[PDB]
Amino acid sequence: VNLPKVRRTHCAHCNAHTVHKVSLYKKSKDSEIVSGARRYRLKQKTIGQTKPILKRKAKLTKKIMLKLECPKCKKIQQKVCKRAKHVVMGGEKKRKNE
Amino acid sequence: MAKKKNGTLANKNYKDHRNGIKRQKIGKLLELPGVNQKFLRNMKYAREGLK
Amino acid sequence: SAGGYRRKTRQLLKQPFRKHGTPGLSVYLATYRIGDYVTISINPSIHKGMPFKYYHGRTGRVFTVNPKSVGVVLHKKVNGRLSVKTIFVRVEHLKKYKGRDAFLERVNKNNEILKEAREKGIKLEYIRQKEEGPREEFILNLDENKPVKVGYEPFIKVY
RNA sequence: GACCCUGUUGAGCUUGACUUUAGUAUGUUUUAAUAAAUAUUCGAAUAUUUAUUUAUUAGAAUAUAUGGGGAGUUUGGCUGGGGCGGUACAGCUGUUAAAAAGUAACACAGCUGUCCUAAGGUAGAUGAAUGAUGGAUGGUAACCAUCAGUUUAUUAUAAGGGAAUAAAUCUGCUUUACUUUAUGCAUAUGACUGUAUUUAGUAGGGAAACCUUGGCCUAGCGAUCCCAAUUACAUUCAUUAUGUAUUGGGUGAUUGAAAAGUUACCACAGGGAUAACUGGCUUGUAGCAGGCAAGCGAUCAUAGCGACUCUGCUUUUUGAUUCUUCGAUGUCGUCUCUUCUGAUCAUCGUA
RNA sequence: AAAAACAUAGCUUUUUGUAUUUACAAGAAGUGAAUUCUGCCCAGUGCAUUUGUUAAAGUUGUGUAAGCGAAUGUAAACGGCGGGAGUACUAUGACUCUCUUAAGGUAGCCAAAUGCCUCGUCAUUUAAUUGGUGACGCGCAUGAAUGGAGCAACGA
RNA sequence: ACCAAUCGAACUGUGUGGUAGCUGGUUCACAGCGAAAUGUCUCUCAGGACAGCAGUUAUUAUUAUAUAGGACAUAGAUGUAGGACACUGUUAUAGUUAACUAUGAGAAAUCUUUAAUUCUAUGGAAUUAUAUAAAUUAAAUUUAUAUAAUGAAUCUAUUGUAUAACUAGUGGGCACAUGAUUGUAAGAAUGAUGUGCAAAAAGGGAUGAACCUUAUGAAACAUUAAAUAUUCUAAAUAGUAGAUAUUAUACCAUAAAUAUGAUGAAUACAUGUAUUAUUGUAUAAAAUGGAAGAAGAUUACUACUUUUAUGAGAUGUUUCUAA
RNA sequence: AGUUACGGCCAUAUCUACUGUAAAACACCGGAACUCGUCAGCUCUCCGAAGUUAAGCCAGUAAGAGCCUUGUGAGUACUGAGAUGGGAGACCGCUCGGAAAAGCAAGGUGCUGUAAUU
Ligand SMILES: [Mg+2]
Ligand SMILES: [Mg+2]
Ligand SMILES: [Mg+2]
Ligand SMILES: [Mg+2]
Ligand SMILES: [Mg+2]
Ligand SMILES: [Mg+2]
Ligand SMILES: [Mg+2]
Ligand SMILES: [Mg+2]
Ligand SMILES: [Mg+2]
Ligand SMILES: [Mg+2]
Ligand SMILES: [Mg+2]
Ligand SMILES: [Mg+2]
Ligand SMILES: [Mg+2]
Ligand SMILES: [Mg+2]
Ligand SMILES: [Mg+2]
Ligand SMILES: [Mg+2]
Ligand SMILES: [Mg+2]
Ligand SMILES: [Mg+2]
Ligand SMILES: [Mg+2]
Ligand SMILES: [Mg+2]
Ligand SMILES: [Mg+2]
Ligand SMILES: [Mg+2]
Ligand SMILES: [Mg+2]
Ligand SMILES: [Mg+2]
Ligand SMILES: [Mg+2]
Ligand SMILES: [Mg+2]
Ligand SMILES: [Mg+2]
Ligand SMILES: [Mg+2]
Ligand SMILES: [Mg+2]
Ligand SMILES: [Mg+2]
Ligand SMILES: [Mg+2]
Ligand SMILES: [Mg+2]
Ligand SMILES: [Mg+2]
Ligand SMILES: [Mg+2]
Ligand SMILES: [Mg+2]
Ligand SMILES: [Mg+2]
Ligand SMILES: [Zn+2]
């Protein structure tokens, strides 16, 4: 699947169409001051393990998240596409019958 | 199980007609959900200037 | 034949013989007002606005008129009772329900008989539909009618 | 009922099942003072090593590894009995299916966890597949003209449906693969999902009417808690944390526990809702007979046999089903002894 | 359930030179008198020996662990020890070619308490044998201290 | 193997009235009313919850200007039996100058076609005059809303209809008639429509959960239904004719391919040869002593009609008890 | 009474052969200086009026193919309700109701709305 890097869409803050810029999305690294880690750090000071881990899974590929960005607002939007195995952005377009 | 019977549809019709079959009355028209919103606003304005 | 939106439609959503193609202009010129009577017939050449296959051929009433849809009210038979359904369809799937035309003519003509009897002192002689009772009497003539003798006939094999 | 099955009932035992622990190995910090030597870092800080007596009860607190020597617990469902095999455990099309709607089988033939910045949107132009007759090298089959050509061709894919001024092939231009108020249909007493329709904006194609909320339509569908990202704001002050809204990370047993075996040393509650033996309905298999007559018999169908086909009986083999017995009806063979059937091995009478 | 099971002497491997006891001693394992033998394999799993990855505590700051991984030995440690084609009246194949592997069952033994087809083939024992004994071997699935071969004495 | 008649973890007291989706039991009379064995979800299949079926109490009348497991009149939807070889799949042979013409066979996943049946909707409201709008149009121009007036119009039945609140049992079903799928077949397995047994009395099928007559308090008298009239056993051995075989049952408790006889039967042909209808015998073999219900019957068997009589909480007449 | 511009229903309006039409109209027809389009003024686009009724449009003929309609087929096939009717079975017969197609004959070959011109 080939995806472009420039898309001109409606922006809600400016109330007009404006050229956006497209980038991929990756899950960032978690931290230990969030409340889910402070509970789990103090529960685990007991002999054994207290919370389950998922062991059997069957999915193969994940969905795609995008990031459009208005230059005037400097504010980001998020959009979603279907599942795909090979994702390349900004490639060279198709050539008609050569 | 003992590979029992899966399921039938016998006397479904007999249990229905025990107390009759009631017909739910449609009310007055222009009151059912889904009327055009542009049509309803003009109907409201026409009644206020009447009375 | 699993549970989907368009299951088991082979002879219900097939266009008949020597009648393929996009519909004509006489469909689009018709108008609908609130309170009429409308039957539903699916034309299987457009794919925007088709109802479910259960409602093919049931008559309802029109209560709303939108820029792209018409609203029809019906009755469905859910397990015990008779409920109320509403659907929005396009204009290329409807048909004007006849059957009140002989009734609405009788309303207009009885309303004229009531008007002419106001100027007189007589009682009203309304128009109502006829009744069929016992067989009436008739008169036959034996001047030109001669009876024909009928009897049995012996059996004859076909070969 | 000890055999067999069920129970979200147990116990003894093993191990590359899940989760841990006694014992033990190795770091760091605590350790008598003194003098000297050596090394490593920049006069100073660390480390190593020797000597003396003024200490010398011999240990303590933490971290990583090893650890069936031990300790708890688990080891799906459907099923013509269970196991082995398959998944009929989630979605989609045609037939079973009996001219409104609805409907079963470890019944029939199949498909699905994908592909696409164009295979999405719009404007315009256009006789596709094939056949006939001809044209230097040119042949069954290279390319060019003429005539015919009702859908045979194509439309990402399973099957069904639709489309001939075309939804197909080309040429141009674009990102509606949008943001916000309300409602319906599968469909219900009911979540999640798919898909039609509306109020107000902002855009693309076109001369304009008009079309456009992803693929011509019916499939590629995932809650609570927690984690990551985006947009608004909230407190004496900075940074952080917590709240409301939207997406992504996932449970294929698909409306969703975190999980390997064995018992012939075995235990408990129950089950004829369910097997191993007798009985009962059935006769594929087994056994015993019939009808017709191509031919064999030195010529002659029927002295004696009989191919290709067709119609029966019996309960004497072996199967198919699970109606009665699981708070018990003692299995194979042999020894002894009585009686019964004709489909007669001799003995009797005929042909 | 008295035996073909256990024990036994005999044979072999291993740990310890700071033992109230002191290596002709003290702990841990396997086979099972004597005679004759004890073949090949360290790729896998274990065991031993020797120079990329990895926690906490401390210091203005920085640095340094065992273990795992890699190399070399070890099978009287757990264990394992193939298949197809042509070639000297018929027939067979001393000899040759070829897939791979860690190595491709050697000395011996047998339808044996170990052979499904199977009541294997030949001889002998009997009037008559699915029994017994002696020979044969492409051995479903024999085989060397998980011991192979063997009977003098002894046996409810 | 042994550790006090106990050992694959001894014996005594306590936590303890340990938990059980699993067996067993559950105590007085009469009266009113009366079911389900089906759909969806479930580490769910010997169990649960929601929906359906039931009971009790309450308020209210043009929701009789209304309703109906009905009919009639009108307007419609459909692709199953039958039909066809024209489209898709299939098949045997002869002709004429690859194309046309014939006689034959066909379809659960084929259609130029197309019934009986099943189902949906209308059978009373409509017109006139005046007004309102911020919708809509080139426009009083339409789309909508008010107020006033003008009305009972298809046959039959129903004196009530409608609305709330609270709560139990059940979720293993089986049989007959009609028509189907798998299987050689089954008192086999699994679906569709109606009625039953479960939970239903009396009379008849000799006996039998489901077959045939048939609606319900305690009794007496007359009339029938289903079925029977030699005797057991209440009720006429009340008629025409045929059957020679120990003949004779609606569900129902078995008989075939095949070979041959007989009628004062019929038609064709030369007293007889051919067919057709009715009917008899052979084919026809089992395990303790046997089943038309039995004794026995040839006028107690079989076929077709009319009278008479016997015979059910049925149906009529009289007495009495239940809100 | 026919044509010509917009149409509604969409074969009685299609297909293959021959034959005919006065006026007006509709066509064929003559060319690329400009707008536009190609390899090619073939098509499309833009200016014209010498010639021609040969074709197209319109109307006719055919024991013509195709479509539309009436009769026969036929009370035949089939089917809703029923009985202690018949058969070893496969199935068939009866009572009260509903009711077909394919063929085989006879006949037909567009009807119409608003406007304009002879
Ligand atoms: Mg369970
Ligand atoms: Mg346990
Ligand atoms: Mg354990
Ligand atoms: Mg099971
Ligand atoms: Mg497309
Ligand atoms: Mg779409
Ligand atoms: Mg589920
Ligand atoms: Mg044992
Ligand atoms: Mg027990
Ligand atoms: Mg049973
Ligand atoms: Mg027995
Ligand atoms: Mg046989
Ligand atoms: Mg006994
Ligand atoms: Mg006993
Ligand atoms: Mg005999
Ligand atoms: Mg002894
Ligand atoms: Mg003893
Ligand atoms: Mg021993
Ligand atoms: Mg030895
Ligand atoms: Mg090694
Ligand atoms: Mg070695
Ligand atoms: Mg050898
Ligand atoms: Mg030996
Ligand atoms: Mg022998
Ligand atoms: Mg003891
Ligand atoms: Mg009652
Ligand atoms: Mg029980
Ligand atoms: Mg309930
Ligand atoms: Mg009809
Ligand atoms: Mg019961
Ligand atoms: Mg009775
Ligand atoms: Mg009987
Ligand atoms: Mg008597
Ligand atoms: Mg009497
Ligand atoms: Mg009575
Ligand atoms: Mg009575
Ligand atoms: Zn912006």
PDB file of N, CA, C and O in Angstrom, chain B residues 10-50:
ATOM      1  N   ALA B  10     -43.108 -26.589  17.168  1.00  0.00           N
ATOM      2  CA  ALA B  10     -44.494 -26.972  17.384  1.00  0.00           C
ATOM      3  C   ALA B  10     -45.115 -26.124  18.483  1.00  0.00           C
ATOM      4  O   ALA B  10     -44.420 -25.643  19.380  1.00  0.00           O
ATOM      5  N   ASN B  11     -46.429 -25.928  18.372  1.00  0.00           N
ATOM      6  CA  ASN B  11     -47.312 -25.041  19.134  1.00  0.00           C
ATOM      7  C   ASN B  11     -46.720 -23.667  19.443  1.00  0.00           C
ATOM      8  O   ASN B  11     -46.979 -23.115  20.515  1.00  0.00           O
ATOM      9  N   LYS B  12     -45.964 -23.077  18.518  1.00  0.00           N
ATOM     10  CA  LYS B  12     -45.717 -21.645  18.609  1.00  0.00           C
ATOM     11  C   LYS B  12     -46.977 -20.872  18.257  1.00  0.00           C
ATOM     12  O   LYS B  12     -47.276 -19.843  18.868  1.00  0.00           O
ATOM     13  N   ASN B  13     -47.744 -21.376  17.289  1.00  0.00           N
ATOM     14  CA  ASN B  13     -48.971 -20.703  16.886  1.00  0.00           C
ATOM     15  C   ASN B  13     -50.061 -20.865  17.931  1.00  0.00           C
ATOM     16  O   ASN B  13     -50.955 -20.023  18.038  1.00  0.00           O
ATOM     17  N   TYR B  14     -50.012 -21.945  18.707  1.00  0.00           N
ATOM     18  CA  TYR B  14     -51.044 -22.166  19.713  1.00  0.00           C
ATOM     19  C   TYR B  14     -50.844 -21.255  20.913  1.00  0.00           C
ATOM     20  O   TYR B  14     -51.816 -20.806  21.527  1.00  0.00           O
ATOM     21  N   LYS B  15     -49.591 -20.962  21.259  1.00  0.00           N
ATOM     22  CA  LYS B  15     -49.333 -20.119  22.417  1.00  0.00           C
ATOM     23  C   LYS B  15     -49.596 -18.655  22.106  1.00  0.00           C
ATOM     24  O   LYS B  15     -49.861 -17.861  23.014  1.00  0.00           O
ATOM     25  N   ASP B  16     -49.528 -18.275  20.830  1.00  0.00           N
ATOM     26  CA  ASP B  16     -49.749 -16.882  20.457  1.00  0.00           C
ATOM     27  C   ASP B  16     -51.208 -16.491  20.599  1.00  0.00           C
ATOM     28  O   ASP B  16     -51.525 -15.467  21.213  1.00  0.00           O
ATOM     29  N   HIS B  17     -52.112 -17.297  20.056  1.00  0.00           N
ATOM     30  CA  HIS B  17     -53.523 -16.953  20.001  1.00  0.00           C
ATOM     31  C   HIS B  17     -54.277 -17.270  21.282  1.00  0.00           C
ATOM     32  O   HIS B  17     -55.505 -17.365  21.245  1.00  0.00           O
ATOM     33  N   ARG B  18     -53.583 -17.446  22.408  1.00  0.00           N
ATOM     34  CA  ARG B  18     -54.272 -17.702  23.666  1.00  0.00           C
ATOM     35  C   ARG B  18     -54.996 -16.458  24.153  1.00  0.00           C
ATOM     36  O   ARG B  18     -56.167 -16.519  24.538  1.00  0.00           O
ATOM     37  N   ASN B  19     -54.313 -15.319  24.147  1.00  0.00           N
ATOM     38  CA  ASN B  19     -54.908 -14.053  24.545  1.00  0.00           C
ATOM     39  C   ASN B  19     -55.208 -13.147  23.364  1.00  0.00           C
ATOM     40  O   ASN B  19     -55.259 -11.929  23.539  1.00  0.00           O
ATOM     41  N   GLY B  20     -55.392 -13.701  22.173  1.00  0.00           N
ATOM     42  CA  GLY B  20     -55.569 -12.891  20.988  1.00  0.00           C
ATOM     43  C   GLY B  20     -54.264 -12.286  20.524  1.00  0.00           C
ATOM     44  O   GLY B  20     -53.188 -12.523  21.076  1.00  0.00           O
ATOM     45  N   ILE B  21     -54.358 -11.488  19.467  1.00  0.00           N
ATOM     46  CA  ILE B  21     -53.216 -10.755  18.935  1.00  0.00           C
ATOM     47  C   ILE B  21     -53.574  -9.277  18.917  1.00  0.00           C
ATOM     48  O   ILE B  21     -54.483  -8.861  18.190  1.00  0.00           O
ATOM     49  N   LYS B  22     -52.867  -8.486  19.716  1.00  0.00           N
ATOM     50  CA  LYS B  22     -53.179  -7.071  19.848  1.00  0.00           C
ATOM     51  C   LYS B  22     -52.520  -6.277  18.735  1.00  0.00           C
ATOM     52  O   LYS B  22     -51.383  -6.560  18.349  1.00  0.00           O
ATOM     53  N   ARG B  23     -53.225  -5.273  18.230  1.00  0.00           N
ATOM     54  CA  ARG B  23     -52.706  -4.397  17.191  1.00  0.00           C
ATOM     55  C   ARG B  23     -52.367  -3.047  17.803  1.00  0.00           C
ATOM     56  O   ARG B  23     -53.265  -2.313  18.225  1.00  0.00           O
ATOM     57  N   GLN B  24     -51.077  -2.725  17.845  1.00  0.00           N
ATOM     58  CA  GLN B  24     -50.626  -1.488  18.463  1.00  0.00           C
ATOM     59  C   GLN B  24     -51.010  -0.289  17.611  1.00  0.00           C
ATOM     60  O   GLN B  24     -50.633  -0.191  16.442  1.00  0.00           O
ATOM     61  N   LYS B  25     -51.753   0.634  18.211  1.00  0.00           N
ATOM     62  CA  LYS B  25     -52.382   1.728  17.484  1.00  0.00           C
ATOM     63  C   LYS B  25     -51.351   2.790  17.126  1.00  0.00           C
ATOM     64  O   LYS B  25     -50.697   3.349  18.012  1.00  0.00           O
ATOM     65  N   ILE B  26     -51.205   3.059  15.827  1.00  0.00           N
ATOM     66  CA  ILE B  26     -50.468   4.235  15.393  1.00  0.00           C
ATOM     67  C   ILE B  26     -51.243   5.468  15.807  1.00  0.00           C
ATOM     68  O   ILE B  26     -52.456   5.566  15.584  1.00  0.00           O
ATOM     69  N   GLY B  27     -50.552   6.422  16.403  1.00  0.00           N
ATOM     70  CA  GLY B  27     -51.217   7.602  16.903  1.00  0.00           C
ATOM     71  C   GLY B  27     -51.568   8.590  15.813  1.00  0.00           C
ATOM     72  O   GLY B  27     -51.816   8.251  14.659  1.00  0.00           O
ATOM     73  N   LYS B  28     -51.614   9.855  16.209  1.00  0.00           N
ATOM     74  CA  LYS B  28     -51.751  10.923  15.237  1.00  0.00           C
ATOM     75  C   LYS B  28     -50.458  11.054  14.446  1.00  0.00           C
ATOM     76  O   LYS B  28     -49.365  10.872  14.985  1.00  0.00           O
ATOM     77  N   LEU B  29     -50.583  11.361  13.157  1.00  0.00           N
ATOM     78  CA  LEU B  29     -49.405  11.572  12.327  1.00  0.00           C
ATOM     79  C   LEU B  29     -48.709  12.873  12.709  1.00  0.00           C
ATOM     80  O   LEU B  29     -49.223  13.668  13.499  1.00  0.00           O
ATOM     81  N   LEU B  30     -47.516  13.073  12.149  1.00  0.00           N
ATOM     82  CA  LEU B  30     -46.547  14.139  12.439  1.00  0.00           C
ATOM     83  C   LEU B  30     -46.077  14.080  13.887  1.00  0.00           C
ATOM     84  O   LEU B  30     -45.622  15.099  14.407  1.00  0.00           O
ATOM     85  N   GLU B  31     -46.186  12.936  14.559  1.00  0.00           N
ATOM     86  CA  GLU B  31     -45.721  12.771  15.928  1.00  0.00           C
ATOM     87  C   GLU B  31     -44.772  11.598  16.082  1.00  0.00           C
ATOM     88  O   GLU B  31     -44.149  11.457  17.137  1.00  0.00           O
ATOM     89  N   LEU B  32     -44.665  10.749  15.066  1.00  0.00           N
ATOM     90  CA  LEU B  32     -43.739   9.635  15.107  1.00  0.00           C
ATOM     91  C   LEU B  32     -42.306  10.152  15.009  1.00  0.00           C
ATOM     92  O   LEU B  32     -42.072  11.226  14.458  1.00  0.00           O
ATOM     93  N   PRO B  33     -41.338   9.439  15.579  1.00  0.00           N
ATOM     94  CA  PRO B  33     -39.955   9.919  15.522  1.00  0.00           C
ATOM     95  C   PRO B  33     -39.381   9.853  14.115  1.00  0.00           C
ATOM     96  O   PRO B  33     -39.501   8.848  13.414  1.00  0.00           O
ATOM     97  N   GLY B  34     -38.753  10.953  13.708  1.00  0.00           N
ATOM     98  CA  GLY B  34     -38.110  11.031  12.418  1.00  0.00           C
ATOM     99  C   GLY B  34     -38.641  12.088  11.478  1.00  0.00           C
ATOM    100  O   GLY B  34     -38.293  12.060  10.293  1.00  0.00           O
ATOM    101  N   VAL B  35     -39.469  13.016  11.960  1.00  0.00           N
ATOM    102  CA  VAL B  35     -39.984  14.072  11.099  1.00  0.00           C
ATOM    103  C   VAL B  35     -38.853  15.040  10.748  1.00  0.00           C
ATOM    104  O   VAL B  35     -37.882  15.201  11.496  1.00  0.00           O
ATOM    105  N   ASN B  36     -38.952  15.631   9.553  1.00  0.00           N
ATOM    106  CA  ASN B  36     -37.983  16.610   9.071  1.00  0.00           C
ATOM    107  C   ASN B  36     -37.889  17.807  10.010  1.00  0.00           C
ATOM    108  O   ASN B  36     -38.902  18.419  10.358  1.00  0.00           O
ATOM    109  N   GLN B  37     -36.662  18.126  10.430  1.00  0.00           N
ATOM    110  CA  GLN B  37     -36.461  19.183  11.417  1.00  0.00           C
ATOM    111  C   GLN B  37     -36.776  20.554  10.844  1.00  0.00           C
ATOM    112  O   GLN B  37     -37.244  21.443  11.564  1.00  0.00           O
ATOM    113  N   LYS B  38     -36.505  20.751   9.556  1.00  0.00           N
ATOM    114  CA  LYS B  38     -36.821  22.019   8.915  1.00  0.00           C
ATOM    115  C   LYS B  38     -38.322  22.201   8.795  1.00  0.00           C
ATOM    116  O   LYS B  38     -38.833  23.322   8.888  1.00  0.00           O
ATOM    117  N   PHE B  39     -39.047  21.099   8.612  1.00  0.00           N
ATOM    118  CA  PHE B  39     -40.497  21.166   8.521  1.00  0.00           C
ATOM    119  C   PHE B  39     -41.125  21.442   9.881  1.00  0.00           C
ATOM    120  O   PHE B  39     -42.189  22.065   9.966  1.00  0.00           O
ATOM    121  N   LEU B  40     -40.476  21.001  10.960  1.00  0.00           N
ATOM    122  CA  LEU B  40     -41.080  21.139  12.281  1.00  0.00           C
ATOM    123  C   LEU B  40     -40.907  22.542  12.843  1.00  0.00           C
ATOM    124  O   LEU B  40     -41.763  23.019  13.594  1.00  0.00           O
ATOM    125  N   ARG B  41     -39.795  23.208  12.516  1.00  0.00           N
ATOM    126  CA  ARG B  41     -39.561  24.552  13.034  1.00  0.00           C
ATOM    127  C   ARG B  41     -40.553  25.548  12.457  1.00  0.00           C
ATOM    128  O   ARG B  41     -40.995  26.467  13.151  1.00  0.00           O
ATOM    129  N   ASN B  42     -40.915  25.379  11.187  1.00  0.00           N
ATOM    130  CA  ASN B  42     -41.889  26.274  10.580  1.00  0.00           C
ATOM    131  C   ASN B  42     -43.284  25.999  11.115  1.00  0.00           C
ATOM    132  O   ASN B  42     -44.125  26.902  11.164  1.00  0.00           O
ATOM    133  N   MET B  43     -43.544  24.756  11.518  1.00  0.00           N
ATOM    134  CA  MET B  43     -44.835  24.413  12.102  1.00  0.00           C
ATOM    135  C   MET B  43     -44.996  25.050  13.475  1.00  0.00           C
ATOM    136  O   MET B  43     -46.093  25.487  13.845  1.00  0.00           O
ATOM    137  N   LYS B  44     -43.899  25.150  14.224  1.00  0.00           N
ATOM    138  CA  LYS B  44     -43.936  25.780  15.538  1.00  0.00           C
ATOM    139  C   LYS B  44     -44.170  27.282  15.427  1.00  0.00           C
ATOM    140  O   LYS B  44     -44.945  27.853  16.204  1.00  0.00           O
ATOM    141  N   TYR B  45     -43.534  27.932  14.448  1.00  0.00           N
ATOM    142  CA  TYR B  45     -43.685  29.375  14.284  1.00  0.00           C
ATOM    143  C   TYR B  45     -45.078  29.739  13.800  1.00  0.00           C
ATOM    144  O   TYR B  45     -45.572  30.835  14.081  1.00  0.00           O
ATOM    145  N   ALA B  46     -45.724  28.837  13.064  1.00  0.00           N
ATOM    146  CA  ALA B  46     -47.041  29.138  12.516  1.00  0.00           C
ATOM    147  C   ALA B  46     -48.122  29.050  13.583  1.00  0.00           C
ATOM    148  O   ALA B  46     -49.214  29.602  13.416  1.00  0.00           O
ATOM    149  N   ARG B  47     -47.843  28.356  14.685  1.00  0.00           N
ATOM    150  CA  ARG B  47     -48.863  28.187  15.709  1.00  0.00           C
ATOM    151  C   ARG B  47     -48.828  29.318  16.725  1.00  0.00           C
ATOM    152  O   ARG B  47     -49.857  29.662  17.316  1.00  0.00           O
ATOM    153  N   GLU B  48     -47.653  29.906  16.945  1.00  0.00           N
ATOM    154  CA  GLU B  48     -47.538  30.979  17.925  1.00  0.00           C
ATOM    155  C   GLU B  48     -48.209  32.249  17.431  1.00  0.00           C
ATOM    156  O   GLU B  48     -48.920  32.917  18.187  1.00  0.00           O
ATOM    157  N   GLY B  49     -48.003  32.591  16.158  1.00  0.00           N
ATOM    158  CA  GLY B  49     -48.638  33.776  15.606  1.00  0.00           C
ATOM    159  C   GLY B  49     -50.130  33.597  15.415  1.00  0.00           C
ATOM    160  O   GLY B  49     -50.869  34.573  15.268  1.00  0.00           O
ATOM    161  N   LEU B  50     -50.589  32.345  15.403  1.00  0.00           N
ATOM    162  CA  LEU B  50     -52.018  32.072  15.394  1.00  0.00           C
ATOM    163  C   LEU B  50     -52.666  32.512  16.699  1.00  0.00           C
ATOM    164  O   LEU B  50     -53.508  33.416  16.710  1.00  0.00           O
TER     165      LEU B  50
END
